[PDB]
A paper describes a structure:
Compared to TbREX1, TbREX2 and TbDSS-1, TbRND is unique, as it belongs to the RNase D (RND) group within the DEDD exoribonuclease superfamily. Like E. coli RNase D (EcRND), Saccharomyces cerevisiae Rrp6 (ScRrp6), and all other RND family proteins, TbRND possesses a single 3′-5′ exoribonuclease (Exo) domain. EcRND and ScRrp6 possess an HRDC (helicase and RNase D C-terminal) domain at the C-termini whereas TbRND contains a predicted CCHC zinc-finger domain (ZFD) at its C-terminus. Depletion of TbRND results in extended gRNA tails in vivo, whereas, overexpression of TbRND leads to a substantial reduction in the total gRNA population and the subsequent inhibition of mRNA editing.
Like the G-form structure, the ZFD also adopts an extended conformation in the Apo-form structure. Structural analysis suggested that the extended ZFD conformations are mainly stabilized by crystal packing. Although ZF3 and ZF4 are also present in the Apo-form structure, they are disordered, suggesting that they don’t form stable interactions with surrounding molecules. In contrast, ZF2 is well defined in both structures, due to its extensive interactions with symmetry-related molecules. In the presence of RNA-12U, Arg179 and Phe311 pack against the RNA and adopt a stable conformation, while in the absence of RNA, the side chains of Arg179 and Phe311 are disordered and flexible, as indicated by their high B-factors and weak electron densities. Interestingly, however, the relative orientations between the Exo domain and ZF1 are very similar in the Apo-form and RNA-complexed structures of TbRND. ZF2 adopts an extended conformation in the Apo-form and the G-form structures.
Residue numbers in the entry: 49 to 341
C-alpha cells in the first residue's frame, strides 16, 4: 500500500504550508534528498535540489522543490517539525543527508532513526557483522520485496556526474518517480523494524546510535574525519556501546553467521542411508527394518 502512494510536487508557498500541516500530524516521516551531481563526485552532497518526505499521517510522497522554493522559504516552514524530537525522522544512511541539512539549510534534525544502521545493528547483535547493506538487500531480507530499480537513464546520468542533473526545471516525470521511490521504501521498512517483537534490538538503542551519527555529521561545516573506518561499515566501538557485544553461531561458536545458517549444523544431522530422510539413521529406519514398527 505504501508502495502506491502518489507523489505531489511542492513548489509554491501555499503547497508548502499544506504539506507542513500534514507532516506535523505524523508520528514518523521518511526523508531523502536529491542533490546536484558534483564534478569531483566528492563526499559532500552537491546543491540540494529536492527533499522528499513520506509520513504515516497521509498517503502521499511530498517532493519539496527546494531549488524553486529556495532554502530560506523551505527551512522557515520545516525547521520546527525537523527539530521536533517527538516526530521520528527515518533515513536509510543519514550521514551525507544530515551533513547537507546542517551545511546548506542550517538545520539539525532531532528524533532521527537510521534504518540502514538498524539493519547493521541486527547483523552485529546476531553475527558480529558491522557491514552496511544497500537498500535492495535490506528490502529483500527484511520485507521479502524485490526492489523495482530506478530509471536507468536517471541512474546513468548520476553515475556519469559530468552535469548537475537535478537542476532541470520542470523535472521530467521519470525524475520525479525516481525521487519518490526511496522514501516509500523507508516508511515501509520502518513497519518491519519498529515496534516488532521479533526484532532482536531495541529501537531506542538504534535511536541512540543514530544520534551519534547526527551529532558527528551536523556540525555546520563539511565533515573531514568519518565516523566509520570505511564508508560501507558501522563504527565497531559505537556498536559495542549502544547495541552490546557482537553475536555468533550458537551451534559452532563462529562469528559471522547464525545457527539457522550453520553448514556444520545441517550437514551434521543424521541422514538415513536407506530412505534419505533427515533425522534418523538406517539402523533405526522403520522402512529398512519393519521388525521395528
Ligand atoms: Zn555455525
Ligand atoms: Zn530411513
Amino acid at each position: 500500500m505504501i508502495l502506491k502512494y502518489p507523489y505531489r510536487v511542492v513548489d509554491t508557498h501555499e503547497k508548502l504550508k499544506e504539506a507542513v500541516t500534514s507532516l506535523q500530524g505524523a508520528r514518523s516521516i521518511a526523508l531523502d534528498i536529491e542533490a546536484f551531481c558534483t564534478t569531483d563526485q566528492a563526499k559532500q552532497l552537491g546543491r540540494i535540489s529536492l527533499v522528499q518526505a513520506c509520513s504515516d499521517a497521509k498517503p502521499v510522497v511530498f517532493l519539496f522543490d527546494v531549488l524553486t522554493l529556495t532554502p530560506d522559504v523551505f527551512v522557515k516552514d520545516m525547521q520546527s517539525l525537523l527539530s521536533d524530537r517527538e516526530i521520528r525522522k527515518l533515513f536509510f544512511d543519514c550521514r551525507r543527508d544530515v551533513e547537507a541539512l546542517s551545511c546548506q539549510l542550517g538545520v539539525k534534525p532531532e528524533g532521527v532513526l537510521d534504518l540502514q544502521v538498524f539493519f547493521t545493528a541486527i547483523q552485529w547483535k546476531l553475527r558480529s557483522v558491522n557491514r552496511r547493506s544497500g537498500m535492495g538487500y535490506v528490502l529483500k531480507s527484511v520485507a521479502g520485496l524485490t526492489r523495482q530499480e530506478g530509471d536507468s537513464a536517471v541512474q546513468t546520468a548520476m553515475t556519469l556526474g559530468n552535469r548537475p542533473v537535478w537542476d532541470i526545471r520542470p523535472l521530467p516525470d521519470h525524475f520525479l518517480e525516481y525521487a519518490a521511490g526511496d522514501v516509500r521504501h523507508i516508511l515501509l521498512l520502518s513497519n518491519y523494524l519498529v515496534g516488532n517483537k521479533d526484532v532482536p534490538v531495541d529501537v531506542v538503542a538504534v535511536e541512540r546510535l543514530t544520534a551519534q551519527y547526527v551529532e558527528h555529521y551536523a556540525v555546520g561545516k563539511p565533515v573531514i574525519t568519518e565516523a566509520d573506518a570505511t564508508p560501507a561499515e558501522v563504527n565497531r566501538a559505537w556498536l559495542e556501546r549502544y547495541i552490546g557485544p557482537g553475536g555468533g553461531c550458537h551451534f559452532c561458536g563462529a562469528k559471522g553467521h547464525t545457527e539457522a545458517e550453520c553448514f556444520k549444523k545441517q550437514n551434521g544431522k543424521a541422514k538415513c542411508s536407506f530412505c534419505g530422510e533427515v533425522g534418523h539413521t538406517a539402523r533405526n529406519c522403520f522402512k529398512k527394518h519393519p521388525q521395528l514398527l
